Amino acid sequence: INLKILARLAKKIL
């Protein structure tokens, strides 16, 4: 699943 990866990737670009 690649959905969970987005939750940390989202924080990276904050």
mmCIF file with all atom_site columns, N, CA and C in Angstrom:
data_model
loop_
_atom_site.group_PDB
_atom_site.id
_atom_site.type_symbol
_atom_site.label_atom_id
_atom_site.label_alt_id
_atom_site.label_comp_id
_atom_site.label_asym_id
_atom_site.label_entity_id
_atom_site.label_seq_id
_atom_site.pdbx_PDB_ins_code
_atom_site.Cartn_x
_atom_site.Cartn_y
_atom_site.Cartn_z
_atom_site.occupancy
_atom_site.B_iso_or_equiv
_atom_site.pdbx_formal_charge
_atom_site.auth_seq_id
_atom_site.auth_comp_id
_atom_site.auth_asym_id
_atom_site.auth_atom_id
_atom_site.pdbx_PDB_model_num
ATOM 1  N N  . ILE A 1 1  ? 0.854  -1.207 0.000  1.00 0.00 ? 1  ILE A N  1
ATOM 2  C CA . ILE A 1 1  ? 0.000  0.000  0.000  1.00 0.00 ? 1  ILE A CA 1
ATOM 3  C C  . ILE A 1 1  ? 0.890  1.257  0.000  1.00 0.00 ? 1  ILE A C  1
ATOM 4  N N  . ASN A 1 2  ? 0.534  2.294  -0.767 1.00 0.00 ? 2  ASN A N  1
ATOM 5  C CA . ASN A 1 2  ? 1.390  3.478  -0.860 1.00 0.00 ? 2  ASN A CA 1
ATOM 6  C C  . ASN A 1 2  ? 0.711  4.676  -0.199 1.00 0.00 ? 2  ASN A C  1
ATOM 7  N N  . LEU A 1 3  ? -0.458 4.432  0.369  1.00 0.00 ? 3  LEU A N  1
ATOM 8  C CA . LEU A 1 3  ? -1.237 5.465  1.011  1.00 0.00 ? 3  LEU A CA 1
ATOM 9  C C  . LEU A 1 3  ? -0.538 5.965  2.271  1.00 0.00 ? 3  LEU A C  1
ATOM 10 N N  . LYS A 1 4  ? -0.065 5.027  3.081  1.00 0.00 ? 4  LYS A N  1
ATOM 11 C CA . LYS A 1 4  ? 0.598  5.347  4.335  1.00 0.00 ? 4  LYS A CA 1
ATOM 12 C C  . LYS A 1 4  ? 1.832  6.212  4.105  1.00 0.00 ? 4  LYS A C  1
ATOM 13 N N  . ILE A 1 5  ? 2.543  5.943  3.016  1.00 0.00 ? 5  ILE A N  1
ATOM 14 C CA . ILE A 1 5  ? 3.726  6.731  2.659  1.00 0.00 ? 5  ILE A CA 1
ATOM 15 C C  . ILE A 1 5  ? 3.367  8.218  2.528  1.00 0.00 ? 5  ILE A C  1
ATOM 16 N N  . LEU A 1 6  ? 2.162  8.497  2.031  1.00 0.00 ? 6  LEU A N  1
ATOM 17 C CA . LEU A 1 6  ? 1.739  9.907  1.804  1.00 0.00 ? 6  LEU A CA 1
ATOM 18 C C  . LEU A 1 6  ? 1.637  10.682 3.122  1.00 0.00 ? 6  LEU A C  1
ATOM 19 N N  . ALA A 1 7  ? 1.316  9.996  4.216  1.00 0.00 ? 7  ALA A N  1
ATOM 20 C CA . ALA A 1 7  ? 1.122  10.687 5.502  1.00 0.00 ? 7  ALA A CA 1
ATOM 21 C C  . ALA A 1 7  ? 2.436  11.266 6.013  1.00 0.00 ? 7  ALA A C  1
ATOM 22 N N  . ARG A 1 8  ? 3.546  10.649 5.633  1.00 0.00 ? 8  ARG A N  1
ATOM 23 C CA . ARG A 1 8  ? 4.896  11.214 6.062  1.00 0.00 ? 8  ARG A CA 1
ATOM 24 C C  . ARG A 1 8  ? 5.424  12.148 4.987  1.00 0.00 ? 8  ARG A C  1
ATOM 25 N N  . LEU A 1 9  ? 5.112  11.841 3.735  1.00 0.00 ? 9  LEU A N  1
ATOM 26 C CA . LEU A 1 9  ? 5.535  12.685 2.619  1.00 0.00 ? 9  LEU A CA 1
ATOM 27 C C  . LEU A 1 9  ? 4.836  14.039 2.662  1.00 0.00 ? 9  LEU A C  1
ATOM 28 N N  . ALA A 1 10 ? 3.594  14.043 3.130  1.00 0.00 ? 10 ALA A N  1
ATOM 29 C CA . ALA A 1 10 ? 2.842  15.288 3.300  1.00 0.00 ? 10 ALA A CA 1
ATOM 30 C C  . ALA A 1 10 ? 3.520  16.199 4.323  1.00 0.00 ? 10 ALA A C  1
ATOM 31 N N  . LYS A 1 11 ? 3.952  15.621 5.444  1.00 0.00 ? 11 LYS A N  1
ATOM 32 C CA . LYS A 1 11 ? 4.642  16.381 6.484  1.00 0.00 ? 11 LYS A CA 1
ATOM 33 C C  . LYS A 1 11 ? 5.983  16.938 5.996  1.00 0.00 ? 11 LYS A C  1
ATOM 34 N N  . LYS A 1 12 ? 6.658  16.203 5.114  1.00 0.00 ? 12 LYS A N  1
ATOM 35 C CA . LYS A 1 12 ? 7.956  16.638 4.574  1.00 0.00 ? 12 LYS A CA 1
ATOM 36 C C  . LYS A 1 12 ? 7.863  17.973 3.836  1.00 0.00 ? 12 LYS A C  1
ATOM 37 N N  . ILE A 1 13 ? 6.714  18.255 3.239  1.00 0.00 ? 13 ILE A N  1
ATOM 38 C CA . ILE A 1 13 ? 6.552  19.469 2.455  1.00 0.00 ? 13 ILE A CA 1
ATOM 39 C C  . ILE A 1 13 ? 5.687  20.486 3.187  1.00 0.00 ? 13 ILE A C  1
ATOM 40 N N  . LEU A 1 14 ? 5.888  20.586 4.493  1.00 0.00 ? 14 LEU A N  1
ATOM 41 C CA . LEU A 1 14 ? 5.162  21.562 5.308  1.00 0.00 ? 14 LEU A CA 1
ATOM 42 C C  . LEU A 1 14 ? 6.129  22.603 5.857  1.00 0.00 ? 14 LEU A C  1
#
